[PDB]
Amino acid sequence: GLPARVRDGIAIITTAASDMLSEHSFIPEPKSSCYNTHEKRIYQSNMLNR
Amino acid sequence: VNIGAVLSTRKHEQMFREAVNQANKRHGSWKIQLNATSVTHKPNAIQMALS
Predict the structure, then answer these.
(1) Distance from chain centroid for Cα B21
(2) How many CA atoms lie within 13 A of A46 on its CB side?
(3) Cα B1 to Cα A9, B20, B37, distances in angstroms
(4) Chain A contacts of B45, Cβ < 8 Å?
(5) Carbohydrate attachment sites (chain B)?
(6) DSSP per-residue string spanning A4-49
(7) Which residues of B touch A36 (CB under 8 A)?
(8) Alpha carbon distance A22, A3 (integer Å)
């Protein structure tokens, strides 16, 4: 069911965020904007996917 | 029959309009007209898609 899928996705995201926070002691959750994505791409996490 | 197009500089759009006019002249016997619409490239992909 759709509720099961939504719960699974939320759980996956939360688990990934918790693992990232507990591993490097920080969470890559900066701000965002629709446009003007310049000078902000330097902070390439490459760890959230891991 | 509007025809879109995306060009990096104004000169490219101008020559595209000239080519569309030449094509219309070559097929002037028909009752269908072609209009040239061009836009400039944007650094932001999302902005370009929205435009």
Answers:
(1) 10
(2) 4
(3) 46, 11, 11
(4) none
(5) 35
(6) HHHHHHHHHHHHHHHHHHHHHS--------SS---S-TT----SS-
(7) 44
(8) 28
